[PDB]
Amino acid sequence: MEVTVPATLNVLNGSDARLPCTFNSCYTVNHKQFSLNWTYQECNNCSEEMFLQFRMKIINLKLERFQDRVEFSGNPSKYDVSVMLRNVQPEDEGIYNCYIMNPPDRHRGHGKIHLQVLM
Amino acid sequence: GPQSFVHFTKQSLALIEQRIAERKSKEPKPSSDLEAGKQLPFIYGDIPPGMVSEPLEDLDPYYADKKTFIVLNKGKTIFRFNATPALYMLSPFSPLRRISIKILVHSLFSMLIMCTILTNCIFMTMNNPPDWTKNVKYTFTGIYTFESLVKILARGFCVGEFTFLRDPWNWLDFVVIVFAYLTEFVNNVSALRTFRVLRALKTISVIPGLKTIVGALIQSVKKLSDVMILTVFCLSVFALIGLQLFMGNLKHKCFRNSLENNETLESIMNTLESEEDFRKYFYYLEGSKDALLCGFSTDSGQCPEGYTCVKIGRNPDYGYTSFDTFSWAFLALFRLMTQDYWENLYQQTLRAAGKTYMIFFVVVIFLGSFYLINLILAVVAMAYEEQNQANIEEAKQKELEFQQMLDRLKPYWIKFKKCIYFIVMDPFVDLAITICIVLNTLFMAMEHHPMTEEFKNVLAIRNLVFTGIFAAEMVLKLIAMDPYEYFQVGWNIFDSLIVTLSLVELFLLSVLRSFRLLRVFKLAKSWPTLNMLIKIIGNSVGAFGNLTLVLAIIVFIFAVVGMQLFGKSYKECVCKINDDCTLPRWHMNDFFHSFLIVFRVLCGEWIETMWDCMEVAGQAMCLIVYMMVMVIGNLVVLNLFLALLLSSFSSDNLTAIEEDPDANNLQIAVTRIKKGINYVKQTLREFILKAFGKIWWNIRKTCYKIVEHSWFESFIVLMILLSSGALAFEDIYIERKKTIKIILEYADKIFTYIFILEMLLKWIAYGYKTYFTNAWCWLDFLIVDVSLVTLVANTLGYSDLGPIKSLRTLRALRPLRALSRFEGMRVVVNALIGAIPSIMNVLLVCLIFWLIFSIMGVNLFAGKFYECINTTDGSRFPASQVPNRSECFALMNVSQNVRWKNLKVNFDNVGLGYLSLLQVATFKGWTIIMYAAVDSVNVDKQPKYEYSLYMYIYFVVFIIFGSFFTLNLFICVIIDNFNQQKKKLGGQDIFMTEEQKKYYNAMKKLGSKKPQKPIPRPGNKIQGCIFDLVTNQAFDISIMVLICLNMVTMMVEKEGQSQHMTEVLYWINVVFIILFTGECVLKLISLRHYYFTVGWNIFDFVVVIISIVGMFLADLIETYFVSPTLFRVIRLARIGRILRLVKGAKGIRTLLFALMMSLPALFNIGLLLFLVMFIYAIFGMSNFAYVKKEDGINDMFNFETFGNSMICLFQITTSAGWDGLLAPILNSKPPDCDPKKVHPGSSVEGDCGNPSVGIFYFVSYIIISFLVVVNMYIAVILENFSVATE
Amino acid sequence: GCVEVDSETEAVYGMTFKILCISCKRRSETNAETFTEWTFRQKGTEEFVKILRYENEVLQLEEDERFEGRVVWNGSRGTKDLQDLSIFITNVTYNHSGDYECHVYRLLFFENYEHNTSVVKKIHIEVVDKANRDMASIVSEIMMYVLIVVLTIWLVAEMIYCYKKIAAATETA
């Protein structure tokens, strides 16, 4: 399961941020097992934090500083799990993680994206 | 002038454009011995050294005028270029052109390119190249750029009539170099690196000779237009038939009845998705991936109680086996026509659409796979044969001209040395050595798995002493004979290699112990057929060595291409071809396994791999790749087979040398024994003599007069058939049919009494002499005597005794009396007995050769096939636990359901070696043996997955040698024998009665009226206008196009089509029918009373009528009564409107004439085959009616009845899956069986069979079927040759 | 490897009789767990009253004077997948004439489900003082004999006719 992501992402402050995570899995994705793990971490030393996932339906945990700004904007059936960042601020600058597990393919996918904000 | 060697100069150029000036002011073909790459004529003699690698004048007069020059080299090979300035930039006298053309002609240049190609290939096979390679790749691209620029420098890319572009093979150079450039920079995802593979095709032109080989192959494929048209035609027609009959019958599945919680089939089918889920609802036979086919008929498979038949679901085999649509129907008819794994097609179709549809498969397997393959073989052989004569007619011609043109131009060591050389006295010591050889091989043939210790000790020491003898003989000879000449002789050469290797083991490969067996081949000196085999093998690496090489490079290309396209796909896309989510056992991730799949595709087992391929990496590419492999390989392999075989027939010798011309050891030592045995015969035989009323004649004429009366023969034949049917009624259901049982028992006595009276009459008619010198009479005598032996025993109550009981089982031979009555069967048996001496020679050779292979196998594998499976699942327990027998037995003593179990056909002994090799050589059952060989570790050690992976090479070498070359020997021998026989008869048919002969000659004569009746214009004007209307050259063409449109309207149908589209096709059909009837009645208008004078017209008429009545009757039967099966059977009658398509075609009408021409002889052979099937079926019903339901044997394909027995026998007539039927017969002891099992309602108490009679039965059948089918093959092929010779 | 074969109906008096009742499964492999019970209506009477019930490996018998001591199991033995459920009457009496039928109550156990099913098979038993050979045998015995003898004649006679012709042949000779 290769993951197609842009390593570095520069988005203008206050604009919309398209954060594309995609994969090419040869097996038909079926919603009754396929899982998406959406996590982010700032500095390597500081801890990873989870904000979105997908077990049966799209789950948003509505976090502090991630409140009312993140919604799922992709559809897993066509291998697109992109998300949007509404009206980016300087704060969300950091390193974004999309973890994909698509059974019955055993290999657990992993995309990494660096998001930077320009004034 | 043979000295016309001058340097190419400028004043020549001032002269070359001179003539051309006035040739264009005034308004011969080039010498066939001077074109590029060939050799310069000898008449010109030697080239002065000052001119080698220099431009020379173009001596060809037709090229003399043109702007051009020729270049020659040390190899005397012609290089012809054009004298224009390079790209109109560099004149032919620039120094750079000079040095570059020298470097172009250089032979080390060709060696360099060949070596770069080979290293390129060895790197194309590494699946995961590492870092160094990207750099190497750079080097390779550099070398190819250098070799391209060297040519195009002198060669040009510009048009001077001669250029880099013109020559075809350099197009490949452009495509490769450009693809190297693009992707190195641009950086389709599936097929990135493939086009590199195309570099390896440049082996074709760098290595010399192959250019002619590929030319001849593409010439041989030229004459396949008619045959491939006919093949697609026939497959499409049988696809229409199969699609009509079985649309959607493969989607019948046993469905639950007690559907809980108020759900219909619809409510549940949508919502079902896992294999496991389906099992909760359908009946899946244990351990299979597909649910069971069932049927709505008595003759079909039956659902277990509580399950009812319903057509809902996917199709079996991932959805790839089905007659649902024309495309899958065509694919299924192809897998039938190539007889690949049609065991499952046969069983699935018969299980779903009932068992009486065997007929279809009979008609296809005969008229299709048999006939079409025959057609292809025959036409390829004809083309290659004409090509070989094309070479030979030039071969003497070229030799003849040269000879006429050439003619027209005109101390102590010496004593001991000669002593031992005398002691190498040939007529004796060699025979002693060959005896040592044979004793050795029959000593290594006593290898077997469980050996006592002293046995391996004695084996060891005897080998040692035999190696001692052979090595001593070698040194005797090296010393006595001159050493320089010891190595001169070929056998000596072989033998020296063998003796060295022997001393190698005596120093000790592990395998090489097995290589003392090669010394068997020394027997070839005095055994002419083994000499023939060695010459056959020699012509594989010898003259016909280029062909072998093409085959090698083609298989390499397909291995690398398949790997590059599908290797990753088989890795990510795999959890859908193995539920454990590991690679399957036969795949294309690596180069070795790619190669293995390509090898199997050549062997003809191409569809299971194809389904896996299609499931894993898409349907378009898999099909194209497999279908390219199949065709290319099968044409080349055939070409190789054919080339060798035609070299065997007559080109090996023209009796140039006698049989063993110099006095052979067998021919001198016999005399030294002839002087001995006669000395025995003259001396001691002398020494022992020294020491010591007409009324009988009248009645004989009466009885003899009766016996040849026609009524008598007819009556006896009638009794034969009644006896044979009485045989057929005795199945396991006879405990029911009481009155029939009793009538059969009494009829037994009646026929016994009749036949006894027969033999008594025959005695008096012929007398014991004439009667007892005739074989048929001896056979009938034996049969009647065993019959009356049985009768008497029963009366005396000793019936219980076993020999009598086991003499009953011999009652199945009563059909044999049928042979001597039908002449056709008699003459076929006469022909087939005529040949058996030659089959004895060849079978002995193939037997000794397989013996070498079988001892090789026994040394390698014996006893390593043991595994410790778990019965519940059926799985090898993992090698991590159960490491060895010892921990398999501790396990067995702790838990249950585990048995340290063998393979039941393995390499434990030599006899089992033979059985296993027969299973491998016929490609049936071979996969499980190979799978267990490549898991081998060591005796008492648990096999590991693909641990000794590279043992597959054993079976690869075995297929190539014991299966390919031996069959070639057999086929050659059989053909010589048949031509020998034909000639002895005087060339007449060898399989037809006299009657058959006269009718054959007549029906040959019918196809000879080229010119026909006048058919004059009829009187009345308007109908005369209709006359010239219908007789237009294009009116019939228009009809033909209408038929083709009809054909496609028939193909458009599909399972599941909408109620709309069904009636749309319905009216298209009826408008077609109306239109055909109209054109027909138009024909009747013109040829008043004359429509019926040419047969094809009656064909059209009857097709019209069948078409009309079939449509009417289908309407009636759908309206009034309910009848699906009758509906579809009578609806297929509309196919008649297609079949007239052959009328226009003229390349198909000759091949069908050939078929119908040959039909009688195939009817004869079919009778004989049916008789053999019948006898073997009665033996089946007697013996294996109660074997346990295991592998090939199942509920409906068994030997419990005449229907089922005859079905299994027809299946294995084509040798399809006889291993499956043999597997349960072999098991004889518990726990493999149970010998005290009471079958309910009958008295036979044994579930498991007799191995010995099982093996004899099945091996015999496959051999007899092979010979009768080879006779079929000869009949068809001989007619094709004969009818094409016009 | 079951074949279903009907029972014989003519139990000679005073010697043992074996009543057949064979019931194979539609598809042979399926496991099952059968038990059977047998019923009888005496000749001349209107109702079927139970006689024996074989389940597990027992042959529990309902008490009836007529069949109390003379029935023993001769079915399929020691398995629970009984497919042959026949019974044996040791000393046939005139009281045992009647109509006897059996019921097999199988419970095929399948992949996720079990389907209890029933089959009833009916037999008629007539007791006689002595055996009468089956009609077929008689008709055939007479038949083999008749054909054999007549056939000989066609042969024997024909030979005479020819012999005569041959005699005519000698006559010209």
Ligand SMILES: *[C@@H]1O[C@H](CO)[C@@H](O[C@@H]2O[C@H](CO)[C@@H](O)[C@H](O)[C@H]2NC(C)=O)[C@H](O)[C@H]1NC(C)=O
């Ligand atoms: C032989 O195979 C059977 C079939 O799986 C094993 O029995 C299973 O054992 C597991 C224990 O992990 C249970 O969960 C399953 O329910 C069992 N299945 C059945 C049908 O009983 C058995 O353990 C295996 N034998 C050995 C020695 O491993």
Ligand SMILES: *[C@@H]1O[C@H](CO)[C@@H](O[C@@H]2O[C@H](CO)[C@@H](O)[C@H](O)[C@H]2NC(C)=O)[C@H](O)[C@H]1NC(C)=O
């Ligand atoms: C069979 O395989 C087992 C592998 O465990 C061997 O048995 C072990 O041998 C090692 C080394 O001596 C020790 O741990 C014990 O003696 C055994 N342990 C167990 C778990 O069995 C055994 O020697 C192997 N060899 C044979 C006899 O085939």
Ligand SMILES: *[C@@H]1O[C@H](CO)[C@@H](O)[C@H](O)[C@H]1NC(C)=O
């Ligand atoms: C069965 O299911 C149907 C759903 O179409 C429902 O209308 C009906 O009431 C159900 N019957 C029972 C007895 O639950």
Ligand SMILES: *[C@@H]1O[C@H](CO)[C@@H](O)[C@H](O)[C@H]1NC(C)=O
């Ligand atoms: C199995 O293991 C037990 C353990 O005590 C031992 O007594 C016995 O001999 C072993 N073998 C058998 C066949 O029981």
Ligand SMILES: *[C@@H]1O[C@H](CO)[C@@H](O)[C@H](O)[C@H]1NC(C)=O
């Ligand atoms: C039937 O029983 C009587 C005694 O009641 C006895 O005389 C006779 O031998 C018995 N016959 C058999 C076959 O048991």
Ligand SMILES: *[C@@H]1O[C@H](CO)[C@@H](O)[C@H](O)[C@H]1NC(C)=O
């Ligand atoms: C179902 O099984 C029971 C025993 O559990 C039995 O009494 C009953 O007769 C069976 N019914 C059928 C349909 O056979």
